[model samples]
Every structure is written in structure tokens, then in C-alpha cells.
Target: MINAQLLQSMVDASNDGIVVAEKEGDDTILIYVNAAFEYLTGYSRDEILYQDCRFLQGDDRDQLGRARIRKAMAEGRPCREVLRNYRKDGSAFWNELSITPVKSDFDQRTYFIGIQKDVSRQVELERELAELRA
Candidate 1:
């Protein structure tokens, strides 16, 4: 049988970052972030909770992906995009992220489930391979 403890264990050990953000008055406030998130973004729960995940984008905003993401969020739809995100240490990483809206059974409130993974190495390798093939 699946228990809360078991579910927590699985999420904690997951390689990809998982985050739960509560939708409040048109603002998405981060409620929970998994261990992988902290490791990938270098931001602890205390630093990130109550803040929107957009902070990861830092000053490199106004990207095409942001426009697509905003449109999806406005429509309450799921979206996947690779964004240029920065860590707390000021280093940049390619964050392959997806966000989905989910209704909480207990609170009946809307929440966004965000999954993120750093794909900088993979993207770089793919670019190199494409150049070599040319």
C-alpha cells in the first residue's frame, strides 16, 4: 500500500526537481520544493518558498519561452519549455521545465505542479553535434 511516508521518500530521492505552487490572486506562490530543486537551483526551501519560480530567470528575462509560459499560465494549461535560468551562485543553467495546473482534493484550490531539470550539458552537446554534422 502507498503511504504518505513512502510517497515522500520517492519524491525526495527523485532526480528531477518537483515544486508545488499555490495559485493565489493571480500570483503563484511556491509552497513546496523537493531536494532536487535545492540541489539544482542552489536555493533552499526557506529562500524560495513564498516566492514565484520566475526568480530563477534572474535578469535574463523577456525571452520567447517566458511569453509562451505566460500565455499557458493565463489559460491554466500545461506547458513545457527550456528556459535560461540562473542559480543562486550566479551561474546559468538550461532548465527544462514543465508546469501543470492541478486541483487540490483537500482545499479545492488550484496549484501548479512544476517539474524542472538542468539540461545545459545535453543542450550543449546537441549543439556541438549539429555543428559537426554541418
Candidate 2:
């Protein structure tokens, strides 16, 4: 095992999907996506690099969470929301996403890191739990 690779390997070993994007010039461009991001989205890192993540919206732009995300980014803070993000295969999943803004002390640039999780099963379990209480 390499030394510097210790940190890189730690991030890649995560099960929750993680992506980093540079918020530059009024546009956010993807710079990094971990292994789980590719597994969850069914899109390779090469396919999504250096582009906005709008492709995941899949023409569904009317979500209120979209505004929340923009507001969070504008405020340079973090926000979490559940939204429908489509996979490359066109299948939809409930993405529990939280975006946090971090500024690089070295580059003096701002970046937004997105942490995504598929919570479809959680929602279903919640529904069942509610029914049991009724």
C-alpha cells in the first residue's frame, strides 16, 4: 500500500456516493466523483466529468428542492433534500442529497461537495411503519 494513496483509497472505499464540483464563474463543473457515485448513477466518471450534473434531473426540473440547492449554494452553506435523480438506465431513485460548500485555502476557489444516498427503501419502510401504527 502506498502512502499518499491512503487518503485516496479511504474516500473511494466509501459506500455513499460522493462528488466534488468547482463552483466557478456562475457555473458548477464536476471535478471528482468517487467509485460509489459511478455505481449509483450507472455513469462512469469519464462520462460525467467537467459538466453540470443536470443530466441526472432527466427533464424533471420542477422540484422545489432545486431552489433549495441554489439557495444553499448562493449562501455558501450546506443543505439536504430528497429529490428524484435518474440513473443512466432511466430508472428513477430517491436521492437523499446534501451539498456542502468548501473553499480551497490554496486555490482560493469554492467547491461544492455532494453526498448522495439512495433512500428508496427507507421511504418504503417508513410507509410500512406508518401503516402499522394506523
Candidate 3:
């Protein structure tokens, strides 16, 4: 029962950034992103559309995290992780990413919706607490 407008509205109302991608041949192409995406990443929709998800990756994102995500997607399940994602300006931030796979009812095509919440504050707090514990 959900339409484009409703989907867009949901993204806009959310505080976290959201990215949608569809598989095209062997690559995944960006389809839609919300204002929160721009606010968090400093990249406009135009900059990311038709691009690979690797565009969001930074040097700090762990290889194990990527492997786990792949495993989850391969199993058609949700994957949640805390990793580093970069801004357009090359600045880094911590993101709690939740990736869910969706299948189109009509065509049975699969897509990915990644909802990212900026978790820099939470990460920093944990790091500081760890330092105190150390």
C-alpha cells in the first residue's frame, strides 16, 4: 500500500539519513536519499545518485563489518552495525547503519534501504569511558 510519496515522507520525517539502492547488472545504483542524508554527509542527492555504495565508505570502516553486511544481505536479513562514514568534505563520522533488503511485489526485484543514524556522540562517550576504564 505504500507509494513513492509516502516513502519519501517517511524518509523526510526521520532524524537519521536514509539511502536507497537498486541492483543494476553487477552494480548497485543509488536511487533516493533524503535531506537528512545531505545534512549528515554534506552530499546532495545529485552527487550520489547512480553511484556505488562504496562512495560512503571511509578508511575507518572495518573490513569485518563489510563481510558481515554481505553475509546478512546474502541471507536476506537485516544487518546493523556501527561504522565510519565520510562526508563530502572528507570529514569522518560514526554511523549506526541498518540495512534492510526489500523485494518489489510486482517484479520481484530486490533493493536495499540503508538507514543511518549519526552515532558520533554515542561512540565518543563509549571511547571516553573505555579510556577511563583503562
Candidate 4:
């Protein structure tokens, strides 16, 4: 059996951002964010708590990734996508994100767990190569 405290320690120490959102009604309300999430998005736990993770998308809402995410959420399945997200300062970054649905053992409530990482450099390199080939 996994120790809950130890598992939480691992998540807290992870380099990638982790977000846990409550799946209630028609709203996905953020309930928990790890330290790395605060570092990546420049939003403290207090600021983002109870807010939707979509806030990270900023003004760029019409992305294929969002559609994929919505489909996965609707089906309660896991999905992965790369999205353009913005920091609190409004700087753009490429976020490689994976989302999985889980049920909390404590409350038996549904939640969406999202793992996020910055992939701006890789995205920029790919774009540059594409431009060069074109």
C-alpha cells in the first residue's frame, strides 16, 4: 500500500507542475496545485485555488489541444496535449500537459489530475525547422 504522506511528498517535490481539480457540476474547480505549479505559472496556491485550470490558456482559446482535452474530460479518460499557455506576467510558454481522471480515496470524489511542463524551447525549435524547410 502506498503511504499517502510519502505520495504527497513525491508530488510536492516533482519538477513538473501538478494540478488537481474537483469534477463537480459543469465546472472543473482547481483544488490543489503543487509547488512546481506555482513556479511554472507564477500563480500562488491561494490565487489559483478554486479557479479553473483554463486560466492558464489566457487569450489563446481556439487550440486543437483544448478540443482534445474537452473530449477526454467528457469521456472521463486520460489525454495528453501540448498547449500554448501564459504566465501571470502574460508571457507565452508551450505547456506539455497530461490529464487523467481519478477518484479520491478519502472522499470518493472525482478529480482531474493534470501534469504540466514547459516545452517552449522544443516548440520554438520545431517551428524554426518548419520555417526553414518551407
> Where does model 2 exceed 4 Å of error?
1-3
lDDT of 4 at 43: 85
Residue-wise C-alpha lDDT for candidate 1, range 1-134, written one tens digit per residue:
89999999999998899999887776789999999999899998998898888799899856778877777887889999998989999999999999998866786877889999889999999999999999
- TM-score of every prediction relative to native: 0.93, 0.90, 0.84, 0.86
In model 2, the worst 10-residue window by lDDT is: 59-68
Question: For each candidate, what is the lDDT?
Answer: 0.89, 0.88, 0.84, 0.89
Q: How good is model 2 by TM-score?
A: 0.90
List, residue by residue over 1-134, the lDDT tens digit for candidate 2: 56878988989998789999988676788999999999899999999999987788786777678887887798898999988889999998889888999868788878999999899899999999999999
Per-residue lDDT tens digits of candidate 4, residues 48-128? 899888899889857688877888898899999988889999888989999999966787888899999998998889999
Leading candidate by TM-score:
1
Lowest lDDT sum, 10 consecutive residues, model 3, at 53-62
On residues 1-134, what C-alpha lDDT tens digit does candidate 3 reach at each position? 78999977876999998888877765667788888988899988888787877778866636877888877776778899888888988898988889999978887777999889999998899999999999
Give lDDT: candidate 4, residue 81: 91
Candidate 4: misplaced stretches above 4 Å? 1-4, 103-106, 129-134
